[PDB]
Swiss-Prot record, chain A:
This is Flagellin. The gene is fliC. It comes from Escherichia coli O127:H6 (strain E2348/69 / EPEC). Belongs to the bacterial flagellin family. It comes from the Bacteria. Flagellin is the subunit protein which polymerizes to form the filaments of bacterial flagella. It is found in: Secreted; Bacterial flagellum.
Amino acid sequence: ANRFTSNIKGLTQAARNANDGISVAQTTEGALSEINNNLQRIRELTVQAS
Amino acid sequence: AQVINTNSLSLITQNNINKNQSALSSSIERLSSGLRINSAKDDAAGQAI
């Protein structure tokens, strides 16, 4: 029972820590959306100025 | 009843409910915008093309 309790607490803590990764990746994709849109805009007036 | 120290019966439902908010939030956020990707979460090839 002691081993199972320790294992369950560890699994719960790891499961809680896991969502940190998806939060970080969501922040990163939100940040790089700016790079995507700005690069597309640069391509836009690059086509314009060609 | 016999077991009370861990009420498994109450705890079973929470798993399904937690799996449910994922689909609920996904559907509502795809509705709020006119787009279906709305993120990098979904199939990234479709949004790349």
